[PDB]
Design a protein around this motif. Structure first.
Motif, PDB file in Angstrom:
ATOM      1  N   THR A  96       5.033 -16.794   8.469  1.00  0.00           N
ATOM      2  CA  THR A  96       4.441 -15.846   7.558  1.00  0.00           C
ATOM      3  C   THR A  96       5.344 -14.720   7.531  1.00  0.00           C
ATOM      4  OG1 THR A  96       2.961 -14.997   9.070  1.00  0.00           O
ATOM      5  CG2 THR A  96       2.058 -16.572   7.764  1.00  0.00           C
ATOM      6  N   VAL A  97       5.007 -13.576   6.537  1.00  0.00           N
ATOM      7  CA  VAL A  97       5.790 -12.367   6.544  1.00  0.00           C
ATOM      8  C   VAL A  97       4.698 -11.301   6.319  1.00  0.00           C
ATOM      9  CG1 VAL A  97       7.699 -13.528   5.559  1.00  0.00           C
ATOM     10  CG2 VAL A  97       5.747 -12.820   4.092  1.00  0.00           C
ATOM     11  N   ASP A  98       5.125 -10.108   6.607  1.00  0.00           N
ATOM     12  CA  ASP A  98       4.109  -8.825   6.247  1.00  0.00           C
ATOM     13  C   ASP A  98       4.591  -8.011   5.183  1.00  0.00           C
ATOM     14  OD1 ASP A  98       2.849  -6.481   6.453  1.00  0.00           O
ATOM     15  OD2 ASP A  98       2.842  -6.576   8.440  1.00  0.00           O
ATOM     16  N   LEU A  99       3.268  -7.901   4.320  1.00  0.00           N
ATOM     17  CA  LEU A  99       3.452  -7.239   3.115  1.00  0.00           C
ATOM     18  C   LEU A  99       2.774  -6.106   2.862  1.00  0.00           C
ATOM     19  CD1 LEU A  99       3.273 -10.527   0.746  1.00  0.00           C
ATOM     20  CD2 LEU A  99       5.345  -8.913   1.182  1.00  0.00           C
ATOM     21  N   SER A 100       3.248  -4.983   2.211  1.00  0.00           N
ATOM     22  CA  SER A 100       2.512  -3.651   2.308  1.00  0.00           C
ATOM     23  C   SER A 100       1.571  -3.598   1.013  1.00  0.00           C
ATOM     24  CB  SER A 100       3.628  -2.327   1.721  1.00  0.00           C
ATOM     25  OG  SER A 100       2.781  -1.315   1.904  1.00  0.00           O
ATOM     26  N   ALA A 101       0.393  -3.054   1.274  1.00  0.00           N
ATOM     27  CA  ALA A 101      -0.747  -2.920   0.158  1.00  0.00           C
ATOM     28  C   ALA A 101      -0.352  -2.354  -0.739  1.00  0.00           C
ATOM     29  CB  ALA A 101      -1.847  -2.408   1.104  1.00  0.00           C
ATOM     30  N   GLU A 102       0.532  -1.413  -0.564  1.00  0.00           N
ATOM     31  CA  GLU A 102       1.081  -0.421  -2.008  1.00  0.00           C
ATOM     32  C   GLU A 102       1.607  -1.323  -2.978  1.00  0.00           C
ATOM     33  OE1 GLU A 102       4.551   1.911  -1.394  1.00  0.00           O
ATOM     34  OE2 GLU A 102       3.733   3.517  -2.528  1.00  0.00           O
ATOM     35  N   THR A 103       2.279  -2.344  -2.572  1.00  0.00           N
ATOM     36  CA  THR A 103       2.915  -3.438  -3.668  1.00  0.00           C
ATOM     37  C   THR A 103       1.859  -3.772  -4.350  1.00  0.00           C
ATOM     38  OG1 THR A 103       4.702  -3.642  -1.808  1.00  0.00           O
ATOM     39  CG2 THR A 103       4.360  -5.317  -3.722  1.00  0.00           C
ATOM     40  N   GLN A 105      -1.123  -2.748  -5.085  1.00  0.00           N
ATOM     41  CA  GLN A 105      -1.608  -1.697  -5.975  1.00  0.00           C
ATOM     42  C   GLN A 105      -0.580  -1.542  -7.323  1.00  0.00           C
ATOM     43  OE1 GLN A 105      -4.772   0.220  -5.314  1.00  0.00           O
ATOM     44  NE2 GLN A 105      -4.584  -0.026  -7.077  1.00  0.00           N
ATOM     45  N   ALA A 106       0.583  -1.389  -6.947  1.00  0.00           N
ATOM     46  CA  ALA A 106       1.346  -1.361  -8.092  1.00  0.00           C
ATOM     47  C   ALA A 106       1.330  -2.424  -9.070  1.00  0.00           C
ATOM     48  CB  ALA A 106       2.905  -1.376  -7.579  1.00  0.00           C
ATOM     49  N   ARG A 107       1.446  -3.672  -8.533  1.00  0.00           N
ATOM     50  CA  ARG A 107       1.190  -4.845  -9.644  1.00  0.00           C
ATOM     51  C   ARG A 107       0.074  -4.588 -10.355  1.00  0.00           C
ATOM     52  NH1 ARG A 107       4.972  -8.399  -8.353  1.00  0.00           N
ATOM     53  NH2 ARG A 107       5.793  -8.634  -6.012  1.00  0.00           N
ATOM     54  N   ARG A 108      -1.071  -4.215  -9.913  1.00  0.00           N
ATOM     55  CA  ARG A 108      -2.440  -4.144 -10.772  1.00  0.00           C
ATOM     56  C   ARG A 108      -2.245  -3.209 -11.853  1.00  0.00           C
ATOM     57  NH1 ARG A 108      -3.245  -8.400  -8.528  1.00  0.00           N
ATOM     58  NH2 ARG A 108      -4.847  -8.808  -7.167  1.00  0.00           N
ATOM     59  N   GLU A 109      -1.615  -1.830 -11.372  1.00  0.00           N
ATOM     60  CA  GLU A 109      -1.334  -0.916 -12.268  1.00  0.00           C
ATOM     61  C   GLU A 109      -0.416  -1.366 -13.448  1.00  0.00           C
ATOM     62  OE1 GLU A 109      -0.030   2.670 -10.581  1.00  0.00           O
ATOM     63  OE2 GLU A 109      -1.096   2.504  -8.849  1.00  0.00           O
ATOM     64  N   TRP A 110       0.505  -2.265 -13.237  1.00  0.00           N
ATOM     65  CA  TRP A 110       1.352  -2.724 -14.689  1.00  0.00           C
ATOM     66  C   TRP A 110       0.625  -3.880 -15.006  1.00  0.00           C
ATOM     67  CZ3 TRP A 110       5.059   0.125 -16.078  1.00  0.00           C
ATOM     68  CH2 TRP A 110       5.658   0.867 -15.193  1.00  0.00           C
ATOM     69  N   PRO A 129      10.178  -4.943  -6.086  1.00  0.00           N
ATOM     70  CA  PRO A 129       8.532  -4.551  -5.515  1.00  0.00           C
ATOM     71  C   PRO A 129       7.662  -4.621  -6.586  1.00  0.00           C
ATOM     72  CG  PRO A 129      10.108  -2.865  -4.666  1.00  0.00           C
ATOM     73  CD  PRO A 129      10.887  -3.575  -5.687  1.00  0.00           C
ATOM     74  N   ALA A 130       8.013  -3.750  -7.486  1.00  0.00           N
ATOM     75  CA  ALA A 130       7.031  -4.052  -8.619  1.00  0.00           C
ATOM     76  C   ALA A 130       7.628  -3.255 -10.125  1.00  0.00           C
ATOM     77  CB  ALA A 130       5.710  -3.026  -8.310  1.00  0.00           C
ATOM     78  N   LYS A 131       8.887  -3.455 -10.221  1.00  0.00           N
ATOM     79  CA  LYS A 131       9.472  -3.201 -11.436  1.00  0.00           C
ATOM     80  C   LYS A 131       9.301  -3.797 -12.542  1.00  0.00           C
ATOM     81  CE  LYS A 131      13.500  -1.660  -8.472  1.00  0.00           C
ATOM     82  NZ  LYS A 131      14.626  -1.796  -8.136  1.00  0.00           N
ATOM     83  N   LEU A 132       9.133  -3.173 -13.723  1.00  0.00           N
ATOM     84  CA  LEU A 132       8.795  -3.991 -15.062  1.00  0.00           C
ATOM     85  C   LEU A 132       9.800  -3.999 -15.900  1.00  0.00           C
ATOM     86  CD1 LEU A 132       6.443  -4.933 -16.503  1.00  0.00           C
ATOM     87  CD2 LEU A 132       6.361  -2.518 -17.811  1.00  0.00           C
TER      88      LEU A 132
END
Length: 176
Positions: A96-103, A105-110, A129-132
Motif C-alpha cells: 500500500t501507500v500513504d495518502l494525505s487527506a488534503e488531496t 478535499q481538493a478533488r471534492r472542491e474541483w 495532486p489536484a490540478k485541473l
C-alpha cells in the motif's frame, strides 16, 4: 521519489541492505510476472524502519522502498490491485501507500467544475495532486488553484457563467 510501503516481511538477525533489495525483486516475480519479464525496474534505496527505534506495536516493522521512477511505482500498485493476492514466499503480505487527506478535499472542491465541463464537451481531466486541465477554444489551459480559475474566467464571460456555480465565488467578499 515515489515511496511504496511493504508490510508483512518477517525479521532476521542476518538482515542487510543487499538481502532486502533481493527480497523486493522476488515479490515482483511472484505476483507480477509481467513486470519481471520487462526488467525495467530501477530501485534507488530499500531500508527497514525504524532501524534504531523499536516498534511500539507487536507487529513486524515495515520496509520502505524508494523507486527511481514515480511512474513505475504507480504501475506496481495497479498490478497488485488487479491480482487481488500478493504473497512473499507463499505467505500473505500487503502492499500500500500513504495518502494525505488534503488531496481528497481538493478533488471534492474541483468536483462541480469537472462535471459541468464534461457536459459542455470541454473534455475535463484531473491530474495528481489536484490540478485541473481542460481544452477550450482549441488551446489547452492548466490551473493549479481555484484562484487561478477565477482570474481566467474574468476574460471570457461565457465561461464565467458556466462555472459561476462551480466556483461559488459569490458568498464571502474575502477569500478563505
Amino acid at each position: 521519489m515515489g515511496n511504496l510501503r511493504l508490510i508483512g516481511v518477517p525479521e532476521s538477525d542476518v538482515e542487510n541492505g543487499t538481502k532486502l533489495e533481493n527480497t523486493l525483486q522476488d515479490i515482483i516475480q511472484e505476483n507480477f510476472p509481467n513486470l519481471a519479464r520487462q526488467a525495467n525496474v530501477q530501485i534507488q534505496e530499500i531500508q527497514r524502519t525504524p532501524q534504531r527505534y523499536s516498534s511500539r506495536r507487536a507487529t513486524p516493522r515495515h520496509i520502505i522502498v524508494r523507486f527511481t521512477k514515480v511512474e513505475m511505482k504507480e504501475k506496481m500498485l495497479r498490478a497488485a490491485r488487479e491480482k487481488g493476492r500478493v504473497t512473499l514466499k507463499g505467505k500473505p503480505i500487503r502492499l500500500t501507500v500513504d495518502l494525505s487527506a488534503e488531496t481528497l478535499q481538493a478533488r471534492r472542491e474541483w468536483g462541480p467544475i469537472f462535471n459541468i465541463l464534461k457536459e459542455k464537451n470541454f473534455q475535463p481531466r484531473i491530474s495528481y495532486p489536484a490540478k485541473l486541465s481542460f481544452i477550450s477554444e482549441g488551446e489547452i489551459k492548466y490551473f493549479i488553484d481555484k484562484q487561478m480559475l477565477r482570474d481566467f474566467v474574468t476574460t471570457r464571460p461565457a465561461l464565467k457563467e458556466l462555472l459561476k456555480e462551480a466556483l461559488n465565488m459569490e458568498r464571502n467578499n474575502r477569500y478563505q
